[PDB]
């Protein structure tokens, strides 16, 4: 088929490459540490009050949003300003987290675009919130049978509060239009109130621990990224890699060379990479490709047999899958070494060719010529007695053909807008 | 494409236990957030979650039926195994199993079995019961909460022709699965504690009953009373 042709003649002839492919394409990532502190703010003894609510800022740790969504505890989960299936791979700079209990009925206006008390007076979201808003009961642990009087609230109160606003001081409330300068007089009173924990009130008046994480990002380069996760090792195999995002693909085998502590893979020609350091053990590995190769046929031609040998260049000879030899220009296969040498029919390469037996295909060492010693002596002289006169033929080329090709007939032809 | 295989005893008296398993195929419970759960849907009544089985070993069970509820999960040969007790005439129903891969506040019933039918021998959804409207106008269709806010958690919406498994169309309160038309959409009323299902214009048949749930984790997965809806 490659020859165009339906008989062959004596010879090698290259018909087609050969590639090796793929088949784990493994990821590699170092280990999963400093995991941030979720626990500190979820399972705290210790809660504020809604006026006085705690801000914590936490940055460059890994979150481990599995543990949240696997709890068995939480009342409501509601995110509002991203997709919360992300939360295990999206990156973000700096995150917060606002800890509060407050009754469980005014679970429902911590939201933006809500109105109420606490929405106006004491906590109040902004309407381009993203973030995740946390609540769960905990009855058993902020309620007594004597009656809970320690959580305060702001129920009087000027103005409206701003986002992410606290107010602590705790002056009197101006009502009336004298000023009451203290005095606990009527149009003046506290602007706090106690709520009335009881273990036997209903479920909208128990208390309810609220936990709200809000997420921004900045110019600042992201530190609070999502876990990931990685695969094993295998070694030498035609296989992908992925070591912190670096790509390629070859075979990892152990290396000798010491890297720097501080480095990481080598470029040492033409700015490719062939060694890399494993993050994990902190191995050095080196990277080849696999293979890649041409396929040769010999021949002795479809008038004298139909048989064939087959030759991959450059191949080991391992990844291939009859008489197989190792040559340095790669293995063939369908011929048989012989200890014998002759000259050379069909060349192969390193000194090796191949002829037919005439009935099988063989492969031998060339042989230079016939090998004699001439009998010299300082008193000896050899003359002929005879001759023979030869003659020999020789053929050199002198010409080809003339040709001439015109361009707007071969690039255009006839075409006015072509022209 | 992932399919679910369930098979049973139909026969069944007062005094007599039986036994459900549900096969899967095209995936397997070790992945992680995998999950296999039993829903039953009475002939003429609202369906409701029985229980439900995780990728590791733990158990979610029906607070008003926790007793009588056991459910057993074998990797081996990929099938979970289903058992009840107290066998008691009201009980009889078309069982499902159906998979569901989250957390549980989130991720729907996205994936359901086939019916299988048993018959004896010897925090509350409210929803309208049915609602009629003529073709080529829109139609909005309710589901309130009783006790809560219905922003506390999200809300699902599934569709069911007869004769065949109900399908999710709305989740995550905005999100659309792909392939149902773009005529279906959802919203949320804060004010009114209500939940609304909204199919803008009605250029398509839609003969089918739909279903709101939400989930907490004192009440796990609930389902409402479903609305009836037909062409005029």
């Known amino acids: 088929c490659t020859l165009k042709s339906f008989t062959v003649e004596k010879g090698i002839y290259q018909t087609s490459n050969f590639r090796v492919q793929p088949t784990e394409s493994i990821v590699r990532f170092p280990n999963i540490t400093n995991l941030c502190p979720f626990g500190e703010v979820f399972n705290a003894t210790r809660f504020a009050s809604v006026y006085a609510w705690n801000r914590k800022r936490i940055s460059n740790c890994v979150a481990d949003y599995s543990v949240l969504y696997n709890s068995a505890s939480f009342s409501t989960f509601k995110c509002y300003g991203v997709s919360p299936t992300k939360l295990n791979d999206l990156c973000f700079t700096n995150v917060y987290a606002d800890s509060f209990v407050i009754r469980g009925d005014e679970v429902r206006q911590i939201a933006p675009g809500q109105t109420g008390k606490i929405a106006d007076y004491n906590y109040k979201l902004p309407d381009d919130f993203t973030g995740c808003v946390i609540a769960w009961n905990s009855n058993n642990l902020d309620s007594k049978v004597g009656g809970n009087y320690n959580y305060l609230y702001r129920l009087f109160r000027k103005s409206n509060l701003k986002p992410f606003e606290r107010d602590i001081s705790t002056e009197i409330y101006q009502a009336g239009s004298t000023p009451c300068n203290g005095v606990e007089g009527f149009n003046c009173y506290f602007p706090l109130q106690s709520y009335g924990f009881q273990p036997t009130n209903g479920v909208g008046y128990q208390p309810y621990r609220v936990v709200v994480l809000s997420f921004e990002l900045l110019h600042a380069p992201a530190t609070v990224c999502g876990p990931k996760k990685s695969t094993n090792l295998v070694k030498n195999k035609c296989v992908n890699f992925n070591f912190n995002g670096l790509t390629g693909t070859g075979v990892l085998t152990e290396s000798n060379k010491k890297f720097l502590p501080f480095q990481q893979f080598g470029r040492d020609i033409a700015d490719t990479t062939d060694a890399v350091r494993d993050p994990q053990t902190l191995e050095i590995l080196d990277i080849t490709p696999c293979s890649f190769g041409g396929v040769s046929v010999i021949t002795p031609g479809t008038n004298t047999s139909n048989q064939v040998a087959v030759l991959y260049q450059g191949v080991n000879c391992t990844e291939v899958p009859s008489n197989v030899f190792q040559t340095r220009a790669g293995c063939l296969i369908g011929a048989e070494h012989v200890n014998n040498s002759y000259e050379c029919d069909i060349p192969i390469g390193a000194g090796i060719c191949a002829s037919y037996q005439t009935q099988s295909i063989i492969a031998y060492t060339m042989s230079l010529g016939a090998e004699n010693s001439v009998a010299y002596s300082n008193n000896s002289i050899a003359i002929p007695t005879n001759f023979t006169i030869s003659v020999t033929t020789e053929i050199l080329p002198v010409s080809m053909t003339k040709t001439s090709v015109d361009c707007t007939m071969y690039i255009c032809g006839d075409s006015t807008e072509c022209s | 494409q992932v399919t679910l295989k369930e098979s049973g005893p139909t026969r069944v008296k007062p005094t007599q236990t039986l036994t459900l398993t549900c096969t899967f195929s095209?995936?397997?419970?070790?992945?992680?957030?995998?999950?296999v759960g039993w829903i039953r849907q009475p002939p003429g009544k609202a369906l409701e979650w029985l229980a439900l089985?995780?990728?590791?070993?733990?158990?979610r069970y029906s607070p008003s039926l926790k007793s009588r509820l056991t459910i057993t999960k074998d990797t081996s040969k990929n099938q979970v195994v289903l058992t009840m007790t107290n066998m008691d005439p009201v009980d009889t129903a078309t069982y499902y199993c159906?998979?569901?891969?989250?957390?549980?506040?989130?991720?729907?019933?996205?994936?359901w079995g086939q019916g299988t039918t048993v018959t004896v021998s010897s925090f509350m959804l409210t929803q309208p019961h049915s609602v009629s409207e003529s073709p080529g106008k829109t139609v909005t269709i309710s589901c309130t909460r009783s006790?809560?806010?219905?922003?506390?958690?999200?809300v699902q919406w599934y569709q069911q022709r007869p004769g065949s498994s109900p399908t999710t169309v709305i989740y995550?309160?905005?999100?659309?699965p792909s392939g149902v038309p773009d005529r279906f959409s959802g919203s949320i009323d804060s004010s009114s504690n209500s939940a609304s299902l909204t199919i803008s214009g009605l250029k398509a048949e839609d003969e089918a009953d739909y279903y709101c749930?939400?989930?907490?984790?004192?009440?796990?997965?609930?389902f409402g009373g479903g609305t009836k809806l037909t062409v005029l």
């Open positions: 159906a998979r569901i891969s989250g957390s549980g506040y989130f991720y729907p019933f996205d994936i």
């Open positions: 095209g995936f397997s419970l070790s992945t992680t957030g995998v999950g």
């Open positions: 089985i995780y990728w590791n070993d733990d158990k």
């Open positions: 006790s809560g806010s219905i922003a506390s958690n999200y």
């Open positions: 995550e309160d905005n999100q659309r």
């Open positions: 749930q939400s989930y907490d984790s004192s009440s796990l997965w609930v």
